[PDB]
Design a protein around this ligand. Structure first.
Ligand SMILES: Nc1ncnc2c1ncn2[C@@H]1O[C@H](COP(=O)(O)OP(=O)(O)O)[C@@H](O)[C@H]1O
Ligand SMILES: Nc1ncnc2c1ncn2[C@@H]1O[C@H](COP(=O)(O)OP(=O)(O)O)[C@@H](O)[C@H]1O
Ligand SMILES: [Mg+2]
Lengths: 306, 617, 356, 356
């Protein structure tokens, strides 16, 4: 697993930036191109790599699902791209504008809504950035160049406090502040200055996404038991891994020094957990090709639908 | 003397045209000049009028927004009303200068007004006054004009009803002999400074003329809309060579050739776009040096290898690469400590561009425009070079809810700070800061002329004159006439105001209109930031991935084709990562159908930062 | 004996892990104090320069300036010792005491009150009272009482942020980032006069004191009885325009037992002599006897003559990188012995000492 | 100048979280580097040893030995920086760069290709090239480029696992579990002569250079003109016999501009002096001045003479367990100043530092 760390890490990083504004088809095409490039220069990478399985852990995945995001894989990838950009402010492009509720659920009452069409915009924005509350901006196609410093992050380190110049007077910021931009028009004109400096993410629904959602629907309706079994076994495997790590930490802390019944019970629990892990792996090895059979079974319906 | 803009070189063509111009102007006949933008119609016009004892000169410059009030104000300064209009001089007649007659716009119903005013003046021999409705007689005031052909994007053709009453002349580009003689005179004048190389005047002039001819013949308007070479570029080349030799060290022949090559690089090929075009330019330089200056022991004439700096010493001389890089590094560290901080990485292309922008900024009335993709480091480079030279940055904070009032008040405050308070300012102009064409024509007025007369009228004009008189009495200069105060003010403004233009997407309609403006294209040096070549990307990636542990696995060197390796030949896994990222970026920008649009490299930098952070974790 | 000139090569080389900012000399024993950019403060022996005597990390950022004074107390109750203050970019200045017996730094106290980074600090004694003055980026040229530890008089002489100061008696002149100089009266705070003529930010400006016995000096000898009763005649400047200018400080409307008053017709500085030849910003200057010792960012330290006004000697390529600060010994004070040494500090993490 | 014995009381008592395996010294700054058994590499400065400056996980198994060299590039294109290389049982040879400005480690690259425990690593610099030499327990001595990272030349010089490496000039002596130590050139990789006379594995061997003007040194003066032209005469070897043998390399058949050939009659080293009177295993031997320094496993370190060869000062109760390492400053290279401070290691999770 360490022979392929450099290959698997570069694919995640290159996925966060370049592939924000693409649908499923050219995303897969560029992933094929990237894999060919990595194989050309002899840099090893995981053949069974999945972006969700590499970055989106179970806890944050459940947190995003309970907030209100759709169960589509593409929306999960875009959500992960949006909330893993510490340096570049993300751009939200969704006609449905549903994700405002998702961000409000994620940040609780700290979510404060601002719009570029307002009139008391600059005062409340500078008050919020002085407080450090999270700010979400609507109607991004009418960009106001008064926040160009916030977009470019061109602060200066005046003393021990982070210092920025917005508008006509000096304002101070704090580390807790985060900014988001939400837009509604897919064809709305965007300035190049903002476009090349923000993480442009497209929350839309294309024909390939139509095919994916139809495959999801027919999978969750025709055979719901197998999908529920897959979700249950994945969650059980994650829970078993966490329990194995906790039991290993306890066993090492109890038996690394210098035995008693507690150490023997810990060893028995570790043996049982290892046997359970082996049984779960053996069971999961006979369940993955069923999904290949299903996707070979339910693609003509996708072609008809498109 | 070559710095002064009144100096002309008499050849056969200019004296022939002066003779026939005197013949036409004596004939009580209207005169119209029409030639290419590099013909020097204004030069020959000024030389003919200002050196004749039978005629005078009046200053009128037509623009898109021009009414008869400007003409009335201009004629009021030189003429008088007795109702016959009579010039002040009773011997020398008055010649009405009207340059760029094609520049005023048509009305809402397909007609132009000021050209009909000129038609009435030179046809009905007078005009009707508006406020008192009185007829005016004119007896000895003629009208002259000089405008480009209307086939270019931005000149509106005037009707035949005006051109019927005026004679028309065509002033084509001078032949090789005339240019050779003129620049022979210029090079003898410039070599009078250093007499040790006076025998090389003819090969230098021949090389410059041949280089200009080849540059005009090779790169045309069809490839790029801003490839409008002209003899004005040769004049600017000579001026640059003079301001380089004057502030230079003891001069040798090899250093002379290097100085000429660097000046040619920074005056002729800084507007090129394609890589193969730059290769053709360097081939042209090699061929010209081989043909006309057979000198041995001459080094590389690449753009990076021609580094002339005034920063490292008291005089303009060539400096080594490593010392210049270290000096720029430490100066940029001090600048980002004192001012806004940006994680900037040092590369040779930015060194070349910072030296060329420093050369451009030190010139008198030096203005330039930057053409490059977004996040290519243009505004930060301009701020850095302005802080290096003691300039003051006046960045126009223009938002969407803005109008002409904010623009004119910003310009007025900048002009007052430049003139009254005696502080040099470096003004930046962004593409997004010019919303409507009114700002564009305001910039046209500010750059083509030396000031904006629209800003100072009425009480503003009176308080401007009062402040100018106060400053003149403060400095103890014997100036009393309003004309002396005004032209001293515009001289101070032209001496203490350098403006730069930042353009992101030149393919866009607004950028195309701005670069197609004739008043801004000729007076500003066209600098093409362009896209990053593979070497610059490789250097940036190598300097950004060195801070992270990368080699931790057994790596087998992969044998790939020569053209597939952009970094220095592969030996480590870091070079493999850099080459993979560059190949991905090129393929991705190829498959997004960007066309000939510039490619923003911010994706590369963001990917590198995310890569190093994630691999560290 | 006052016309000593360092030889063409350094006597010894001192290695410091980071960029050297400020260097000062112990006025009684050959000990060199060196500040860093990582925040460390060092101390070295001149006869044994292999390893430092002691080091101490008191600030989280770089030290900008430092000076050394050996106190003199008339009463026998107090003990004479040494005071070191290191103005640093971490918003604070600290006071240290040299321990002769243990050869170990002992921090006395720390002052506060600046709203931005401090760039220069100077110390002096008038009559059995030690005062510390500092200038910072908030334009507040502050003063302090060493025994009390409290602020006394804070004033702002300039719009842009002041950079360097110098103090003598009750008069303080200060360079600033607005390329202008200005005297300010230390007890009152009124701006007596202003100076203009440079075209770049001011780096370092210090006084030109009087001297008792000399063959002839054209820049330190007082002219008339008014100057003799005043005490200050000329001042010297060093800015980023690669020039060193010697100025004449104008007379105020002085009154006996009263504060100085500015002269409406004579409140402007007068440029006397200009110098040029440095290839970059003149970082720091020093005056001893009749010779002007100055540095630059051209990896060199130049020696200038006050009378004839040209560079008598040049020390080119003294450091791989920039040169930061120099130091000599105070010659106008009888308490301090003007020894024959001069020490430099470069940006290339090396410190050179010139002796004999 | 080169005869400064440390004092009885050690200057610093550095606390380490685990047992110390190897210690090297910075050649320009008073900063000591400590390698632990867990693989931690510590950045300790002497004047305040309570807190580590930096500590990164180099390897995961036990680090065996390390060397520190200060790079010296004759071209201004490359800025000189420190290089720290570590070897362990993890089949890895990690290389670190120490930046003094940020006082933290920075891994450059790791060298791979060995198949067993790497024992010793030494650095040496050419005019513009840097090379890394290493040896595993698989009887393989390798050559690693600093920047390329490839393996240039490998060979098998012994029939048992090797534990000692020295590279000075273009030769190498490797002491295995067998007594056999051999000299092999780099361009050819051919053994010349074999050493015998110890009844246990040889742990550490280093050469002895030609010292400068010295009054009465005995084992460093050039004996014959041909030996002086060759440039290296003597050697010092360890053993588990509680003794140290100083050897003598016979001259090989040296021919101009070609790889030389060994001598059949002179294919064996000569024993000059035996260092008897020791009480345990001798781990590390390093040489400086008139005094040869060695470390004892029996809770002590002994430094004996070179001219007369007996005790002058014996250090006891420094560490309660087995002393592992020590580092005399190299007085043999003009690029480094031989300052007066010592450092010793041990197995008691501590390291003692001597200063002056
Ligand atoms: N006969 C000539 N003598 C000297 N310089 C000339 C001559 N003809 C052209 N030039 C140069 O060509 C340039 C033409 O500039 P300009 O008069 O502004 O062109 P235009 O009149 O077409 O706008 C001038 O800078 C001038 O130096
Ligand atoms: N090597 C580089 N060269 C140029 N720009 C860079 C480089 N690395 C990063 N940048 C980015 O470029 C930005 C500055 O570019 P700028 O001149 O403001 O672009 P624009 O001219 O489009 O406004 C910085 O915010 C920085 O993030
Ligand atoms: Mg023209």
């Amino acid at each position: 697993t360490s022979q392929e760390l450099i290959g698997n890490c570069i694919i995640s990083s290159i996925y966060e930036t370049y592939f924000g504004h693409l649908n499923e088809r050219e995303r897969g095409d560029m992933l094929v191109i990237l894999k060919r490039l990595l194989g050309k220069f002899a840099v090893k990478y995981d053949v069974n790599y999945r972006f969700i399985d590499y970055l989106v852990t179970l806890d944050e995945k459940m947190k995003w699902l309970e907030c209100g995001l759709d169960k589509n894989d593409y929306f999960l990838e875009n959500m992960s791209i949006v909330m893993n950009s510490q340096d570049a402010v993300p751009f939200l492009l969704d006609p449905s504008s549903h994700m405002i509720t998702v961000i409000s659920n994620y940040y609780g009452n700290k979510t404060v809504l601002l719009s570029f069409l307002e009139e008391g915009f600059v005062k409340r924005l500078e008050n919020a950035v002085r407080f450090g509350s999270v700010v979400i901006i609507q109607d991004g196609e009418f960009f106001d160049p008064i926040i160009s410093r916030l977009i470019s992050r061109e602060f200066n380190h005046a003393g021990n406090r982070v210092t920025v110049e917005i508008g006509d007077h000096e304002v101070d910021v704090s580390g807790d502040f985060k900014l988001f931009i939400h837009s509604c028009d897919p064809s709305g004109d965007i300035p190049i200055f903002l476009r090349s400096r923000v993480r442009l993410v497209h929350f839309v629904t294309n024909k390939e996404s139509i095919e994916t959602r139809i495959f999801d629907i027919t999978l969750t309706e025709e055979n719901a038991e197998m999908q529920r079994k897959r979700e249950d076994l994945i969650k059980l495997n994650t829970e078993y891994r966490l329990k194995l790590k906790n039991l290993e930490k306890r066993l090492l802390e109890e038996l690394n020094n210098s035995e008693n019944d507690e150490l023997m019970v810990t060893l028995n629990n570790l043996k049982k957990e290892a046997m359970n892990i082996e049984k779960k792996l053996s069971e999961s090895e006979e369940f993955f090709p069923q999904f290949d059979n299903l996707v070979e079974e339910y693609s003509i319906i996708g072609k008809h639908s498109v | 003397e070559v710095m002064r803009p009144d100096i002309v070189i008499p050849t056969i063509d200019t004296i022939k045209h002066e003779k026939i111009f005197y013949d036409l102007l004596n004939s009580k006949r209207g005169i119209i000049l029409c030639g290419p933008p590099g013909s020097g119609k204004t030069m020959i016009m000024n030389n003919a009028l200002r050196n004749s004892s039978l005629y005078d000169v009046v200053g009128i410059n037509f623009s898109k927004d021009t009414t008869t009030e400007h003409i009335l104000s201009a004629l009021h300064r030189h003429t008088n009303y007795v109702l016959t209009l009579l010039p002040k001089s009773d011997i020398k007649n008055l010649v009405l200068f009207c340059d760029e007659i094609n520049l005023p716009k048509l009305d809402k119903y397909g007609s132009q007004n000021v050209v009909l005013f000129l038609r009435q003046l030179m046809e009905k021999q007078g005009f009707w006054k508006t406020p008192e409705n009185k007829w005016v007689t004119i007896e000895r005031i003629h009208i002259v004009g000089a405008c480009n052909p209307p086939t270019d994007p931005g000149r509106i053709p005037m009707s035949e009803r005006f051109t019927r009453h005026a004679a028309i002349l065509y002033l084509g580009y001078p032949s090789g002999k005339s240019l050779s003689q003129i620049y022979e005179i210029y090079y003898k004048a410039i070599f009078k400074l250093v007499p040790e190389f006076r025998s090389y005047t003819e090969p230098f002039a021949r090389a410059s003329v041949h280089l200009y001819n080849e540059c005009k013949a090779r790169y045309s308007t069809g490839l790029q809309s801003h490839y409008l070479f002209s003899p004005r570029e040769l004049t600017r080349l000579v001026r640059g060579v003079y301001t380089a030799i004057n502030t230079g060290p003891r001069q040798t022949l090899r250093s002379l050739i290097r100085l000429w090559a660097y000046e040619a690089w920074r005056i002729f090929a800084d507007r090129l776009v394609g890589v193969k075009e730059k290769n053709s330019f360097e081939q042209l330089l090699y061929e010209t040096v081989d043909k006309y200056l057979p000198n041995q022991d001459l080094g590389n004439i690449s753009s990076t290898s021609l580094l002339f700096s005034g920063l490292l010493s008291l005089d303009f001389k060539e400096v080594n690469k490593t010392d210049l890089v270290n000096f720029i590094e430490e100066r940029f560290k001090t600048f980002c400590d004192e001012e806004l901080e940006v994680p900037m990485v040092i590369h040779e292309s930015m060194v070349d561009h910072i030296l060329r922008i420093d050369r451009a900024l030190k010139q008198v009335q030096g203005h330039m425009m930057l053409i490059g993709a977004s996040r290519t480091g243009k505004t930060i480079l301009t701020r850095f070079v302005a802080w290096l030279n003691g300039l003051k940055i006046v960045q126009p904070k223009i938002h969407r809810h803005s109008n002409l009032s904010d623009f004119d008040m910003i310009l007025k405050k900048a002009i007052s700070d430049c003139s009254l308070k005696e502080s040099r300012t470096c003004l930046i102009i962004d593409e997004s800061n010019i919303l409507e064409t009114a700002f564009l024509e305001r910039m046209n007025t500010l750059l083509a002329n030396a000031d904006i007369p629209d800003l100072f009228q009425g009480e503003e004009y009176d308080k401007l004159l009062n402040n100018l008189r106060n400053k003149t009495r403060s400095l103890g200069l014997l100036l009393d006439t309003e004309q002396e105060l005004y032209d001293w003010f515009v001289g101070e403004i032209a001496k203490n105001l350098h403006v730069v233009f930042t353009i992101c997407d030149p393919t866009n309609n607004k950028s195309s209109a701005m670069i197609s403006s004739p008043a801004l294209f000729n007076r500003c040096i066209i600098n093409w930031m362009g896209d990053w070549d593979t070497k610059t990307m490789s250097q940036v990636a190598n300097n950004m991935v060195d801070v992270v542990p990368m080699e931790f696995t057994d790596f087998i060197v992969p044998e790939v084709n020569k053209e597939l390796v952009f970094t220095e030949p592969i030996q480590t896994i870091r070079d493999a990562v850099v080459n993979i990222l560059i190949h991905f970026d090129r393929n991705f920008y190829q498959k997004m159908k960007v066309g000939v649009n510039p490619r923003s490299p911010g994706y590369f930098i963001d990917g590198l930062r995310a890569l190093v952070k994630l691999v560290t974790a | 004996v006052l016309k000593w000139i360092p030889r063409n090569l350094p006597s010894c080389l001192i290695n410091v892990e980071s960029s050297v900012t400020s260097v000062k000399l112990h006025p009684n024993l050959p000990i060199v104090f060196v500040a860093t950019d990582h925040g460390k403060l060092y101390a070295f022996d001149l006869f044994n320069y292999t390893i430092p005597l002691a080091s101490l990390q008191s600030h989280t950022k770089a030290i900008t300036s430092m000076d050394v004074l050996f106190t003199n107390y008339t009463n026998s109750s107090k003990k004479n010792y040494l005071v070191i203050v290191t103005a640093s970019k971490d918003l604070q200045i600290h006071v240290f005491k040299w321990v002769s017996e243990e050869c170990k730094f002992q921090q006395i106290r720390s002052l506060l009150g600046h709203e931005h980074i401090v760039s220069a600090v100077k110390i002096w004694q008038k009559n059995n009272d030690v005062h510390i003055a500092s200038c910072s980026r908030d334009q507040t040229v502050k003063i302090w009482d060493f025994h009390n530890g409290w602020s006394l008089k804070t004033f702002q002489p300039h719009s842009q942020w002041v950079r360097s100061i110098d103090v003598l008696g009750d008069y303080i002149i200060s360079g600033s980032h607005d390329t202008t100089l200005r005297l300010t009266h230390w007890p009152s705070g009124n701006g007596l006069s202003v100076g203009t003529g440079h075209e770049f930010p001011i780096e370092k400006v210090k006084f030109i004191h009087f001297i008792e016995d000399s063959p002839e000096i054209r820049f330190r000898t007082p002219s008339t009885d008014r100057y003799k009763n005043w005490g200050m005649q000329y001042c010297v400047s060093a800015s980023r325009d690669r020039t060193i200018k010697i100025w004449e400080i104008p007379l105020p409307t002085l009154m006996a037992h009263r504060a100085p008053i500015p002269n409406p017709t004579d409140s402007n500085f007068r440029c006397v002599l200009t110098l040029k030849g440095h290839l970059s910003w003149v970082r720091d200057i020093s005056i001893r006897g009749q010779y002007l010792f100055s540095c630059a960012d051209d990896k060199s330290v130049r020696c200038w003559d006050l009378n004839t006004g040209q560079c008598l000697h040049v020390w080119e390529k003294l450091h791989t990188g920039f040169v930061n600060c120099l130091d000599l010994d105070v010659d106008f004070d009888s308490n301090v012995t003007p020894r024959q040494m001069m020490v430099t500090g470069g940006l290339d993490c090396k410190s050179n000492v010139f002796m004999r």
